[model samples]
Target: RVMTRGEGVYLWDSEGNKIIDGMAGLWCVNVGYGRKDFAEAARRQMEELPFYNTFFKTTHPAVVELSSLLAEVTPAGFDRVFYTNSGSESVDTMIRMVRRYWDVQGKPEKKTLIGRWNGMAHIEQPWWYKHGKDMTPDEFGVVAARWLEEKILEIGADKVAAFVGEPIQGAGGVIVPPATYWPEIERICRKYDVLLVADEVICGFGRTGEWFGHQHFGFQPDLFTAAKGLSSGYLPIGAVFVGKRVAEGLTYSGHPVCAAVAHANVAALRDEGIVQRVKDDIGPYMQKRWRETFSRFEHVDDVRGVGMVQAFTLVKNKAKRELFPDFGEIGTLCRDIFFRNNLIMRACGDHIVSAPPLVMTRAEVDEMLAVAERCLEEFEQTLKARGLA
Candidate 1:
């Protein structure tokens, strides 16, 4: 429960307690809270027309404007947009779009798409294994990339249409891969004539400092999905940035209604200059603070990620770089402590993750980091009680 809210990152709970919103209300609310302009825009739109379905042969002005704005804001050569209610739907749409593209190109057999094992796709399924944090440094990044390559070959690379993955595994604990990983994966995909699809649902729209997270790696993708920050969570919207080949295949097909909402949301965000503000101010500030905070923690194994989307895994022994015995259990304990402290943070295994609102201020960031430190200390006490510290 929350009592009050304001811009630039501070929220009060139901009990009249104010706290720093470290997780950005599930990584949305990028422009911060209590923006009357955004609220008024939604209210005005609702008064005019509240409900509309993109499923039928109808479109609206908001939808049309947002789509055109998206084409201009996204990476070069990505001129298409497909709307979905959420990031998950966008992901599903991408899978279908890629397969459809292959079938249209007369490669119906090329239907399988490769994805990283720990990459946060198909998140509805639970991963039950209690893998230790930083347990095997050698097996983290490149090994995962190799797993993708192996899977591609095992499934018959010629039958695979594309490789869909996130630049930084978001729900997989904001897991940042090693430097050599993406380049190697790109090489493998290119050699096999497979499309590289970057799922940028969480990393796009300046959440990652760059316009898209993949831009940080210098590897180009054939297709990509984006959402969440598109309208700064002002509305339900998402998109797929289609490349030249995919665009060529869509010459005879159209999703008129979905295209319209995408267009509308894009216009509102662009007109307000929200995207540029995130890139120029919030992204870099959060990135810098994340690194500094991680360095202050003795148990922090490594601090990795670009822009505001960042995470740090807890280690049992920093000297040996050892991981906890029951990493998943420890994560829950840490998360619970943060909840008790009125801090909202996500825990994946032993990593405590955060992707705060892009408009977070320097003071709010400090408070959030302070709460995280307290949670970590509480976790350490728990470990000592168990003779595990």
Candidate 2:
């Protein structure tokens, strides 16, 4: 369908079919859509300064004001900020910074950055629902975190530059790690003298009911990267929050108009109590309703989430916790049903993930899930009709 417009939690296609945007336009749009003020902020800035580069000898007020606001919101000791154009760029910049950090310390061999995915020095993630295997979440958390230590020893700590992870894995299926996981990861990183970094692309700016995802996870990163909600996708912008150890870093040519819009977005998130609402009000309501709606499905297991981000696995057998063969295909079949029914959620393998705008209300929560429920009903029938179950 051709996309046309969006307002609040709803989107309209060219055909004018109203759809609930459960994925929140790739997990951004925290402040939601149709914010005229944010648009005006960009408009005003463009007419005034328009654009500038940080690479030159000069700096602009837009970015300077943004950096000051960020310092107040970000964790203490993170007084420096480097701007980027997107989350992927943020990650690339962080990688370069990590390697450069080691080089500056006179240990150029410490250039490897480990992530929790296949290839690139893989390690098991704390998706206790799938991998816990009879261990309590807390217990599995400890065991899962130790995997990093094991990998460090295997790779030789002297060669490992950093351990970079998303506080709550977003595109990797909204894998909310156990409470015990991050603290242990921090301890291990400190013991080995390797840098700990966070990819806050999805979890930043109130997605997880905190100023940043690391705040929810309760661990401090030497540096962290953010985007998406940085400007609530109102404009393209990204940032690297450098802690003191690394504060001692680089010049991205962030557009002045984008910086002004981003500043407005962050300010709205705080001033309107949007982030606090996620923690104290809407987040709990969404989590409670999410589990209630999805957990009853025969093929759905491990119904889990935190704040606005939640997901459930489509399984061959819930009793045995068996996944369907050809992992991604089943989720595609299911996701198609949601689209046909004018709802949106993502299929990361067999895991169906939903992250609506943080500004979503208690009523919109029910409406989105009510549509999702019917879609799942069709999905179960389709599985049996195709003899895939």
Candidate No. with top TM-score: 2
lDDT of every model, 2 decimals: 0.70, 0.90
lDDT at position 205, candidate 2: 90
Write the residue-wise lDDT of candidate 2 on 1-389 in tens digits: 78898898999999989999998897999988889999789889988988776467767889888988988788899987888989989998898989998988899999888889721487988888678899999999999999999999999999999999999999889888898999999999999999999999999998888888899889999999998579999999998889999877324457788899999998999999999999999999999999999999889999998888899999999999889898898899999999889988989999999999999999999999999998998998888898877
Clashes of each: 9, 0
Model 1 alpha-carbon miss at residue 249, Å:
1.8
Number of the top lDDT candidate = 2
Q: Candidate 2, which segments miss by more than 4 Å at Cα?
A: 53-58, 118-120, 249-253
* Candidate 1 collision pairs: 62-264, 63-260, 63-261, 65-263, 66-262, 66-263, 66-264, 67-262, 67-263
How does residue 328 of candidate 2 score in lDDT? 90
